[PDB]
Design a protein around this nucleic acid. Structure first.
Ligand SMILES: [Mg+2]
Ligand SMILES: [Mg+2]
Ligand SMILES: [Mg+2]
Ligand SMILES: [Mg+2]
Ligand SMILES: [Mg+2]
Ligand SMILES: [Mg+2]
Ligand SMILES: [Mg+2]
Ligand SMILES: [Mg+2]
Ligand SMILES: [Mg+2]
Ligand SMILES: [Mg+2]
Ligand SMILES: [Mg+2]
Ligand SMILES: [Mg+2]
Ligand SMILES: [Mg+2]
Ligand SMILES: [Mg+2]
Ligand SMILES: [Mg+2]
Ligand SMILES: [Mg+2]
Ligand SMILES: [Mg+2]
Ligand SMILES: [Mg+2]
Ligand SMILES: [Mg+2]
Ligand SMILES: [Mg+2]
Ligand SMILES: [Mg+2]
Ligand SMILES: [Mg+2]
Ligand SMILES: [Mg+2]
Ligand SMILES: [Mg+2]
Ligand SMILES: [Mg+2]
Ligand SMILES: [Mg+2]
Ligand SMILES: [Mg+2]
Ligand SMILES: [Mg+2]
Ligand SMILES: [Mg+2]
Ligand SMILES: [Mg+2]
Ligand SMILES: [Mg+2]
Ligand SMILES: [Mg+2]
Ligand SMILES: [Mg+2]
Ligand SMILES: [Mg+2]
Ligand SMILES: [Mg+2]
Ligand SMILES: [Mg+2]
Ligand SMILES: [Mg+2]
Ligand SMILES: [Mg+2]
Ligand SMILES: [Mg+2]
Ligand SMILES: [Mg+2]
Ligand SMILES: [Mg+2]
Ligand SMILES: [Mg+2]
Ligand SMILES: [Mg+2]
Ligand SMILES: [Mg+2]
Ligand SMILES: [Mg+2]
Ligand SMILES: [Mg+2]
Lengths: 44, 92, 103, 77, 62
RNA sequence: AUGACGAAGUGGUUGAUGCCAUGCUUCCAAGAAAAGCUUCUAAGCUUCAGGUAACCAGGAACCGUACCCCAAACCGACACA
RNA sequence: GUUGAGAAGCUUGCUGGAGGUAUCAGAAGUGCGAAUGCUGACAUGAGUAACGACAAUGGGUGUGAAAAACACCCACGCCGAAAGACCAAGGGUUCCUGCGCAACGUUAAUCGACGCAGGGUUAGUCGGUUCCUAAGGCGAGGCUGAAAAGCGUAGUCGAUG
RNA sequence: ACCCACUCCCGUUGAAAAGGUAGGGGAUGACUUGUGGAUCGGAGUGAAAGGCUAAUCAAGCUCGGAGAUAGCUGGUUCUCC
RNA sequence: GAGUCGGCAAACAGACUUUGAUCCGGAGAUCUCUGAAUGGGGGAACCCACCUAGGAUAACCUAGGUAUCUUGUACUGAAUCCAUAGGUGCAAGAGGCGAACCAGGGGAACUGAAACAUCUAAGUACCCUGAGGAAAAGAAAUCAACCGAGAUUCCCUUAGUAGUGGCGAGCGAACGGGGAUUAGCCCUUAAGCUUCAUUGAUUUUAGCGGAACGCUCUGGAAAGUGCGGCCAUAGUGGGUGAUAGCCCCGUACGCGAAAGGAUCUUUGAAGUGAAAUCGAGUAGGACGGAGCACGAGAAACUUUGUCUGAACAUGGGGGGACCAUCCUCCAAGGCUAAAUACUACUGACUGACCGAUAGUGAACCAGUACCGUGAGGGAAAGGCGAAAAGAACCCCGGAGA
């Protein structure tokens, strides 16, 4: 049974990484929200 | 290297059983080096210091071990190791 | 400036040794001090081949709170409080009762 | 954007109101047209995007006085 | 070495004083890497002397 | 493990889905791109620079490399049919 | 033990080891058995079902507090277009050695992908990086759009080639 | 092989939140498959089943409006007259 | 002014310090890499460069520069003759983050109306932009009512009144009055504001001194018992072996700055306000919207998307349809403090606030563990003793538990 998580660190980086978030304005909002909450990890 | 960088490249000899066996059998000496030390900087440092002639330097990076202990997952530093082969006569 | 300093003749004014005198051997940062011959405790020390300790019930002084001792006036033979008489350019410790230096 | 270069008229909002008084958000846009204005002192045609009121201002004030205001306002033609 | 006596020397003298301290630091590192270093205060004090020399060198040659 | 020696080490046949083959034939649904590479000149450069060939000398940096990988080490909460 | 009609009060033995509060007022997060209430602890079922492919074990020896399971030896059986050997992805030290067995391992464990410590990965030629581009991305100016932006030229990235 | 999923049985606090054994269909094609990429919430995608869009679909998830509203169900704690 | 080498969290080592260490405060220096990230690229913390100057001979090293855009300026520069567009250099500036407050652009629905569409929710939530310590507004083309008031902003009233409203549910003034603050200046160019000097005042960022208690009983320990004192501009603080004005640290009170920051000020200098020179595509009008408590109503006024369009103080605006008379003001140019809003942050003080299922989600290594592709969700977990004095040694047990 193939499950939903098929890991690919390259795909993970390009969809959820720091530069993917910084590229847009809503992505920068995620980083602002996660900095304001104090998340130790900011992106993945 | 063209400065006081010569003294910041070699961190010390490696004291393993594989190191001593290499020193005796072959003429290779295992050193701990700075993580940003190129193979040319290591060769020059071992020639300026220790006053020997280096034949070939091979390097490898060593991952620091994690040791998840005592309220969290820690991690030792990544470090670099150099295998330094000299001429047969020299003993460093 | 500490009112009670290392190497000072003091008298125990509170505790099990109340009345005994001694010299301050060590001053600690938790408002505690060590006085010779005062507050002995019997510590059950496990012997170690290293460090040269043979074990046994080792007896040693235990730290005592700084406010449980008083500076000792040898002139009046009693405990005294300590003030600070700041001179023209020097600060020195004097006894409150007699206004005379401790030293 | 749909802004007049002369008057600064831009889109404004408002309501469409039906006979039963249902209100619908709508926009009111300026009557923007592209027009080339002859500038004798430059011997050049300057193409502007103006509302029809902005073209009337150029008739009343002249393209030279209008273009000077455009330079002082910063945005270029 | 206190900065008072460091500040008297010239730039050339200060630069050889740094090269000497760096060689002492390197030698102390070799001893520590083989367990042959009885002292341990020298490691911390040698790098304070290097910091002192570099501080004077920075402020002497403006 | 320890360190020296160490014989024979040749013919026949069979034979790939591997190679020739990015070939050949045929078909229709008509089958990447760019660079490296070769060559030609323009602007420039003209005793130069550059190019070619020979010889000599030297170099080839940095990162990965353990281990599992139809699995108990990956995706399935599990040492999961 | 005792007192009151009651909510309750009072006295005292033991435990406890530093706080409590008469009286009369004043303020309330003021009284719990239910809400398939919420959190934690612990029952019943019950020492019951189960111990995860029906490829399979037997013996000897050792070690050890202890051996069906660890190691070795002699047999037996199973896979063998894999249940063998690799490359990639993914994981990240699980690799090897010494010491160890609380917990983890569906039992025991001396054994382990488990705990503690040390060691171990060496490149001009392998794979990356570097060069080049595909889809596609971003995209100076630019065009467009209330704003945020959208699209896209020059370019610049982007391998699965 | 690989992809699929027609039948029975088992399993149904499963070895498994869809499997297994035995049979079954396609197996040079409108084929299967890896890597990378594009399209998404009244929107996408659909050889069309209202199918699928991270075990969630006649309008995903997440946070906010928000303590929506609930003529409904449940519950509502000491004493006495 | 005598100890010290930060904490969990100590153990041994090696040292430092009355040649004044640790520590506290001011000013400097250094300040890897990522991130607006800015030399180019990128899967953040990585990869690859170029230019200049210097120094090494090998395979480099040191220092600086190299983003884009805006403004200004200099040099060049097409189609195209002059030009212009463009290109290159230089100088200045900006970009990003931050809980709320402010101004503005866009703008729901659930809900209520006991259904629902006008209406409500609400110009709310949310998204976006810009600015500042406040912002905005602001010096009557304003009200009033024939008496007068005299910018703006904020509080209390008027008043749930007038009005508005499928005249339903709802929405909801003003005049007038009482207060807080008070300030007005210019376009024949000012009050102000900014910056740099400059004269004095404070204030802030380390600190210093700081009173006065003994005996006795119980007790492990006294601060508690009993007796007797003293200080108080210091008496209900925190600790100390049980409850301390007099044991310690403090407290009232009085002093203190080499250096930096800040706020008031006295002068001075430029800069700005600055729009130049009294307001024309403006006032008014028609259509369609929005706002004014006002939902078209008998609907004044403001505003503008479309279309038009005056007069010039002998003029013009308003006084809630509209007209006449009267009163009042002078729009189409500007600047302006205070009273007002907010607190992510720093300090002190306080509480008929909580006290570990409470109080922050978080008293503890918590936005952690863990869950999720991700946005995001999101815990549990405090207490030996006064002091480790944390149990030497013996015995059983596997050199265990
Ligand atoms: Mg080699
Ligand atoms: Mg390598
Ligand atoms: Mg390998
Ligand atoms: Mg599962
Ligand atoms: Mg198993
Ligand atoms: Mg499995
Ligand atoms: Mg109960
Ligand atoms: Mg009940
Ligand atoms: Mg039964
Ligand atoms: Mg049974
Ligand atoms: Mg059974
Ligand atoms: Mg089994
Ligand atoms: Mg056992
Ligand atoms: Mg295998
Ligand atoms: Mg591990
Ligand atoms: Mg192993
Ligand atoms: Mg077990
Ligand atoms: Mg292990
Ligand atoms: Mg684009
Ligand atoms: Mg652009
Ligand atoms: Mg490329
Ligand atoms: Mg490839
Ligand atoms: Mg058939
Ligand atoms: Mg149907
Ligand atoms: Mg699904
Ligand atoms: Mg719906
Ligand atoms: Mg609501
Ligand atoms: Mg509800
Ligand atoms: Mg960069
Ligand atoms: Mg970049
Ligand atoms: Mg020309
Ligand atoms: Mg800004
Ligand atoms: Mg309703
Ligand atoms: Mg500011
Ligand atoms: Mg203002
Ligand atoms: Mg009058
Ligand atoms: Mg003092
Ligand atoms: Mg005092
Ligand atoms: Mg007690
Ligand atoms: Mg005017
Ligand atoms: Mg008008
Ligand atoms: Mg008017
Ligand atoms: Mg009237
Ligand atoms: Mg005006
Ligand atoms: Mg809590
Ligand atoms: Mg409790």
């Amino acid at each position: 049974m193939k499950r939903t998580f098929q890991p690919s660190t390259l795909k993970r980086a390009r969809v959820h990484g720091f530069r993917a978030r910084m590229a847009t304005k809503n992505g920068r909002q995620v980083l602002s929200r996660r900095r304001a909450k104090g998340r130790k990890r900011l992106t993945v | 290297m063209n400065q006081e960088r010569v003294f910041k490249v070699l961190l010390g000899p490696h004291i393993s059983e594989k190191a001593t066996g290499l020193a005796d059998g072959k003429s290779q000496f295992v050193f701990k080096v700075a993580t940003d030390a190129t193979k040319l900087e290591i060769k020059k440092a071992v020639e300026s210091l220790f006053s020997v002639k280096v034949q070939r330097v091979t390097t490898l990076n060593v991952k620091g071990k994690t040791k998840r202990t005592a309220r969290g997952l820690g991690k030792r530093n990544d470090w670099k190791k150099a295998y330094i082969a000299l001429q047969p006569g020299q003993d460093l | 400036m500490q009112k009670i300093r290392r190497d000072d003749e003091v008298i125990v004014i509170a505790g099990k040794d109340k009345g005994k005198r001694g010299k301050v051997l060590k001053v600690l940062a938790d408002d505690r001090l060590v006085v010779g011959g005062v507050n002995l405790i019997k510590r059950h020390t496990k012997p170690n081949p290293m460090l040269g300790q043979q074990g046994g019930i080792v007896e040693k002084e235990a730290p005592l709170h700084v406010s449980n001792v008083a500076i000792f006036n040898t002139e009046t033979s009693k405990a005294d409080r300590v003030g600070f008489k700041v001179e023209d350019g020097k600060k020195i410790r004097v006894f409150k009762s007699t206004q005379k230096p401790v030293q | 954007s749909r802004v007049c270069q002369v008057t600064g008229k831009g889109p404004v909002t408002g309501n469409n109101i039906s006979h039963a008084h249902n209100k619908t958000r709508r926009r009111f846009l300026p009557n923007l047209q592209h027009h080339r204005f002859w500038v004798e002192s430059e011997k050049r045609f300057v193409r502007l995007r103006v509302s029809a009121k902005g073209m009337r201002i150029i008739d009343k004030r002249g393209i030279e006085a209008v273009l000077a205001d455009l330079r002082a306002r910063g945005e270029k033609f | 070495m206190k900065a008072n006596e460091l500040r008297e020397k010239s730039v050339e003298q200060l630069n050889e004083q740094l090269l000497g301290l760096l060689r002492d630091q390197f030698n102390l590192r070799m001893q520590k890497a083989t367990g042959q270093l009885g002292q341990s205060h020298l490691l911390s004090q040698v790098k304070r002397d290097i910091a002192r020399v570099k501080t004077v060198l920075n402020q002497q040659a403006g």
